[PDB]
Amino acid sequence: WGYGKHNGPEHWHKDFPIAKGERQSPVDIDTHTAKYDPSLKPLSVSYDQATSLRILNNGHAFNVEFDDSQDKAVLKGGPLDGTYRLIQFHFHWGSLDGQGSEHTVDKKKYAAELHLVHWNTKYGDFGKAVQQPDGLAVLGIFLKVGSAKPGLQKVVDVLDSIKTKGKSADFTNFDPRGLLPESLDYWTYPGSETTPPLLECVTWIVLKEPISVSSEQVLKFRKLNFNGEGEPEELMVDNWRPAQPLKNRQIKASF
Ligand SMILES: [Hg+2]
Numbered sequence: 001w002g003y004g005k006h007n008g009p010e011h012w013h014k015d016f017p018i019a020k021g022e023r024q025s026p027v028d029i030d031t032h033t034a035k036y037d038p039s040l041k042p043l044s045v046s047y048d049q050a051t052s053l054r055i056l057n058n059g060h061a062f063n064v065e066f067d068d069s070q071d072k073a074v075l076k077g078g079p080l081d082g083t084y085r086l087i088q089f090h091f092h093w094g095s096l097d098g099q100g101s102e103h104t105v106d107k108k109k110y111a112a113e114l115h116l117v118h119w120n121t122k123y124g125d126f127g128k129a130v131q132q133p134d135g136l137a138v139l140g141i142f143l144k145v146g147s148a149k150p151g152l153q154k155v156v157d158v159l160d161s162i163k164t165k166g167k168s169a170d171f172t173n174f175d176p177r178g179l180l181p182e183s184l185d186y187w188t189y190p191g192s193e194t195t196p197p198l199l200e201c202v203t204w205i206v207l208k209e210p211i212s213v214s215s216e217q218v219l220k221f222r223k224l225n226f227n228g229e230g231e232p233e234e235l236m237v238d239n240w241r242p243a244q245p246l247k248n249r250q251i252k253a254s255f
């Protein structure tokens, strides 16, 4: 699987029949059809004790991994029940500034999308987590091209070191708090992972407010390779999945 013509998202269903399941992701957020739910609690992001370990090119994106052996960086509150621990974050981005996000807002596409992946601790590990309807929680943040994001530069500068698939680099003392918008207002809906196995275990929390990144910051993302070292160079761009049918689901807003 990939994002090319021959192995793109239109082909995933063949190896993962769940692709055309009942709660697939991403979706279009219709802000006028979204339901204001007053029962929604504010999000609680506790990332003060976060421990970053490394960054690696997995051939479809770059992942920044965190030590999740203890409740170091957790997510609670909102539509969740219990504590969810950060495991890794990654982005989805396009070839041009006009496309790149997975989720859309009233059909608008952003330049990139950031996913902070978290797993429900009653399940003891990530691996058991993906066997449950409420096993994961993904915080999604849109990126729009504007002013540079200070907090992102440490990531940008290390990309040279993990250019091709399989490469990794030690990546400690990175504070994810540098990537959050000012407001935590969000939309939520029951969905799935956006890449194979496309498991339907995710509670999606998509922030209304986008963060801005400079043209030069997004450029560096586009210089990454899908391919492995010593193989024909294929730029790592447009690693996003198109929006899926909502199919009855209801998107609720915290605002
Ligand atoms: Hg699941």
Ligand SMILES: [Zn+2]
Pocket: 090, 091, 092, 115, 194
């Ligand atoms: Zn993602």
